[PDB]
Amino acid sequence: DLMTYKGEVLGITRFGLAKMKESVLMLASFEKTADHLFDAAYFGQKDSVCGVSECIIMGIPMNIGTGLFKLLHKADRDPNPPKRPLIFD
Amino acid sequence: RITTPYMTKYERARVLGTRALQIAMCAPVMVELEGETDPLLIAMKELKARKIPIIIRRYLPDGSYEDWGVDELIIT
Amino acid sequence: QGRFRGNLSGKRVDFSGRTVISPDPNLRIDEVAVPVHVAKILTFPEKVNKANINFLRKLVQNGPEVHPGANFIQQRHTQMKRFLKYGNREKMAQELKYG
Amino acid sequence: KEQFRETDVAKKISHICFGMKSPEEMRQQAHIQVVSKNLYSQDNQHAP
Amino acid sequence: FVLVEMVDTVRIPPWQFERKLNDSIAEELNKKLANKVVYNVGLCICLFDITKLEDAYVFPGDGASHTKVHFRCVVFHPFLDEILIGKIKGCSPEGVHVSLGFFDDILIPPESLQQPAKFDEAEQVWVWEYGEEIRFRVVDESFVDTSPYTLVGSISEPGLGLLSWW
Amino acid sequence: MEVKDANSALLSNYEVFQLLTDLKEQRKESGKNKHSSGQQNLNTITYETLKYISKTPCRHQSPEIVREFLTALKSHKLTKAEKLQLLNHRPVTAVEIQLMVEESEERLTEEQIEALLHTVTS
Amino acid sequence: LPDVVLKPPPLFPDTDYKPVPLKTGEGEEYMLALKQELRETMKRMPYFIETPEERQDIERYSKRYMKVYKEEWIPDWRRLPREMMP
Amino acid sequence: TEGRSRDGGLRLGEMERDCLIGYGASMLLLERLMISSDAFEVDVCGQCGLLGYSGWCHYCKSSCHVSSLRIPYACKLLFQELQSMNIIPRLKLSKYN
Amino acid sequence: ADFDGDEMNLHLPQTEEAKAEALVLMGTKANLVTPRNGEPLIAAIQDFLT
Amino acid sequence: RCPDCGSTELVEDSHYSQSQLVCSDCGCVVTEGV
RNA sequence: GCUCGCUUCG
Ligand SMILES: Nc1ncnc2c1ncn2[C@@H]1O[C@H](COP(=O)(O)OP(=O)(O)OP(=O)(O)O)C[C@H]1O
Ligand SMILES: [Mg+2]
């Protein structure tokens, strides 16, 4: 399914990986570092941190695994607290 | 309410880690530990007693979210 | 040996050891035996709380020589580390603040 | 009396925008101009 | 005095979880915004109220409780024509040094508009006779950090008459 | 740390006085050692602003009195700044309204001043 | 071999050739005066749209006295497409 | 460092990272490859997206938009080398919320 | 492994969250079966089968 | 001198391949890492 | 301390 989700059978080689993926950092890290980096600098393509490889490189928790969701604290609170009335207005 | 009611192992690991990190930073204990010097053991005791004050915020890929309590979810 | 493959995707870390293995059937499948020598070097930072205070006190009192113990103390207010091999360890144990 | 300035913010990088720099931007970013081809001084201290 | 709406990301450590969230949020906001001047806003006094308080996240980093809080706080910022009553906490030859009562010693009235008997001879002489009134004129703020105060304002004292004190 | 509006709503000194008294009583009922030691500027600014307001005639005020004063001044087509200054200062003498209060020309009418004094003194 | 330089070249190197003096005459001065007049008269023209001031502090009785008044030109909506009508 | 005679530590190779990814342990991978190996705190200017020093941006000659950021030191080295290669990475920072 | 000179590495996490994630997700009791085909890998071996 | 106790007993003592100039009286780590 | 080569180890 990963090889056949864009309508064309794309291989696991660098060409198919470039045609499938969009992240500049992963394309540079896998193969053809300088070429991909210079092409990205020419195109000015902004690369997000959605992928796992860029999350590992930039030192942030990856979106896959335990980092897909967020946790909330069950603290004793009261949303929308009563507001002090304005006397002059 | 549409997701799986069972609490996954990743949620378990993350909740236990957050609870252990909090307890290690002088957080109040709600299970009255009996000689447990390891914060992870205290977190596991709180999870088994279902007294962890943490609400998981499951995010859908499109952007929607939903809140599930630890006591509300099913543990194995 | 580039930056991406040698320094970004895979990089060397500390607090790790490497040793030859030998069989031991008397241990559980989820347990592993660690030598005393490596255990005295690989340290774990435990935060002083209301639960393990009396345990960390005894650990500091033992010192870096006895196996159950510690090697360094980082205060909550100041981040200046203190070596347990020098100075009065009893005074440091008696002055273990939370955090 | 005292101005309110934030000490530290939990900033998270969103995305990296690659690009190029003009020579004027290269001059503005740099601090000093390197014109000497030698490395160290003639004295025995060999200071840069 | 005027209300200002602010949105702040407050971090509460885990050892304050037994306390009520709103009380600790108010305490932290007051500790963060006491005796400080916000640029283009003025000197904030304290927190007035908390309007909106959304969910409290816990980050995989520090592990504390981060809450985005919308609140209204009181600040001291005249409207370029307000009348104030201060006390003379000093005087310079180029201008008197009046200070609002225990509030802020930043009011520097220029002595260039009174009747033509204006001068300060360094002996704390206010003005030659023919609770001190003040008319704020313009606000001005400045930054502090510029290498690897901020509120003075101009004060007017016109020919108010002042039958009580010259 | 951005502000939404620095001029959202002007308030008189009575609201500030009430807020300061409430904060002072809540502090003295919930005094914390480490919280106070972390920042002592809060206590200083609150106490000194409360003392400054106490030096002013801002005492003996209530929300009902402020509402009555506002309803009385609404018939005089005065601006919000003028009534705010009159409430904060509480002028007992006419000369305070004659000269000190701005926009004196064409507004005093030499007859409304007595009504203004009667309203502010009540 | 070329010598080594201890200090960087000057930020503005000197030149032995100076710019030719400007042309003189009644025409150049008249054109200069007319350009200055155009600069002075085109900012007050209604075509010169200024930045709309916002965030008024208070409303006052003097607002009517300080209210800026200026005639506004009416664009010909017959030639201009419908998308620019207010 | 690398060798035992050089008193070096063990290396979490690419396949170890792959195994940690397959397990889904994001926090453990972050602690191993960022916190415990090459953690550093840099100063990034939110206006131009360049790296500053001591809370100051020499490019913009200002310090209001400079903010601290945690980062692997190898990543900062890569960014500096790319800036040397005229491939300027401009970082657009934002709040963690 | 075959205990004929194998050198193995031993890492110590420096975070409570990392420790908990390692114990939960990478627990020996929780990974008794491979994800390839579900067959159990941690089982009896020579001198235990005999 | 030691920054804590002010003593001048600063000895270079390496602790398990860690170059460290430390005070000999109170054990205050003056400098570490090479 | 950087580099390279050989050598072993599983
Ligand atoms: N180049 C290598 N890459 C990966 N693993 C290796 C390599 N060389 C040795 N090993 C390790 O050693 C093990 C190889 O042993 P194996 O080939 O199964 O037995 P053997 O060496 O043929 O012994 P016998 O000759 O059968 O007695 C498996 C692997 O983890
Ligand atoms: Mg082997």
Ligand SMILES: [Zn+2]
């Ligand atoms: Zn900049």
